[PDB]
Amino acid sequence: MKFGLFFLNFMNSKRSSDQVIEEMLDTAHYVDQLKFDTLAVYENHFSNNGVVGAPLTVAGFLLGMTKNAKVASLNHVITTHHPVRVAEEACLLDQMSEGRFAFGFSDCEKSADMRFFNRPTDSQFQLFSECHKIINDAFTTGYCHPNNDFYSFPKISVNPHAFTEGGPAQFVNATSKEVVEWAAKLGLPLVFRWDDSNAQRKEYAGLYHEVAQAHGVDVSQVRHKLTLLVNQNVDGEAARAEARVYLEEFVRESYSNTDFEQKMGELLSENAIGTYEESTQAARVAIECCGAADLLMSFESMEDKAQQRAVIDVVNANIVKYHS
Amino acid sequence: MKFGLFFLNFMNSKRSSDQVIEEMLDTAHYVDQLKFDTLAVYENHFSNNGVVGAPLTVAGFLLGMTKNAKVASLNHVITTHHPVRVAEEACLLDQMSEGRFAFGFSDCEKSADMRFFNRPTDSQFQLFSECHKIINDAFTTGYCHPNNDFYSFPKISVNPHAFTEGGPAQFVNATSKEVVEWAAKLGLPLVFRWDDSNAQRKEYAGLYHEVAQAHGVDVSQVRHKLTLLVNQNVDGEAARAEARVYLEEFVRESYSNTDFEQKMGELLSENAIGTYEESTQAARVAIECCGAADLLMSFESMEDKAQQRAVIDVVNANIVKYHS
């Protein structure tokens, strides 16, 4: 198993945007000396729940600032951008960093961003997939020439050409049955979301495999990733309290019609939140349900910098003793 | 007077893109500890004469690996982008670097690029200033709320808020009379292009001054920038011939045959190209013609990496003795 960190960069009444960005940079710097494999950035727009709207640009900075970690965008939403530019940027990061950039992308999760960037909400899946086809052409051929209802232009060259052969590694967010099935047929790895339930992830996991099994695609060398929140307090009840407030607004913004108490109750017990033992047990359960090979954790909900670093140092010690 | 560098990142057949990027990053690293003030990145698309299509992605990398120099986009074309996306990017650079990013922007010169990106060709200049009012709004207030022919959506918060009061420092490319007058009415400093004649740069400097004087704008603390190509060689014919190869392709793609030979003669005699003395006299004449207070130089045309470093070193020796 491989481990990594991901940054949600949420801001609330106690932590402002300048603060959360400054804390992210300190951690990248710290963790770059350790055994953590990957550092990933989350994308969000117009709300307190995620201050980074341009993950690739933040990935560029982290890349030029660190020496070991691989840096990845965790869920760059491609449907709301021009394919050719996403490829231009991704290939630039690939070149400047010499193969340390990973391309995590996604379909559009919030509809208010679709009806904002004025993209047709009726043909969202076809758009998303056409966008990928164009990016992927560029990655693999250095050129791209589309001829369809969304993008029609001549044969252009996309500079600079990729550094890593075939373009930077890719992985797609498990946002819908349609996407998973789609990812399955191509052999692209998925990243299971932390805001999902264990039940929902096992279902996606199963579907990916049946579709993969059916279309005759070799999924034995594919490494799925799972994201999880980690908060370890000596008083597991405190931990659940602290994470509760962190998540408070996120659950109302994104999960407006489920029932607040239910979802908060589920995110809290299914994520690595609690005492060392509870936190740990939950992790194993989550990994068994989806068959993720890599684990990305977020330690941002712990406000005390001393405590956060302590918990980080332990995860790192376990990686050395048991995963070398 | 202040001095800095800019990267054209042109490529050919005896030079690859993997190569020019590696060379920008090395030069950036050497120069970051010398007396150069700013490092600037040029933008271009689907052509050999400019491999960087995303200067803000590159600026992020450069800012993360440098400690002393300011990094700027020299000509980010905003007309073909969604203004909310640019403001989001620029504000990120401003926060992460703690104010070391400078926003050089520009208008869209090619009608072909307008069609490519679905912007209305004939409205080019109107679209340009509306985009800009949206970005400046975000810089100065943190929210934007347009209501015009191009963009109309309710009020949104653009995260993260700027780090520098008023957003990062801005400047604009003197690409037309229209833009120069526009810039003059706003009190924005210009960046005069290396590829224009002295007569033209002179014309732009005068027009700016007139429009400024007439609208009662105080342009006393406004420092214009000048970009120049530098190729010094003990043999004045050697330098002019080396630069000629560097430029040949650019002159044909851009200045078609507006008598390819007249334009070429001019570029080679007007830029800082020749023996040290020729090179220097040419620089003096250029500054006189436009009143630029800051000078950005490109040393790329010099293929010999030791010869290049020697010139950079001498240039820096001058700043130390005569400009400290």
Swiss-Prot record, chains A, B:
Highest taxon, organism lineage: Bacteria
EC category name: oxidoreductase
InterPro entries for the chain: Alkanal_monooxygenase, Bact_Lucif_Oxidored, Bacterial_luciferase_CS, Luciferase-like_dom, Luciferase-like_sf, Luciferase_bac/NFP
One GO cellular component term: cytosol
Pfam family, one: Bac_luciferase
GO biological process, one term: bioluminescence
Keywords: Flavoprotein, FMN, Luminescence, Monooxygenase, Oxidoreductase, Photoprotein
Protein name according to UniProt: Alkanal monooxygenase beta chain
Organism: Vibrio harveyi (Beneckea harveyi)
Gene behind this protein: luxB
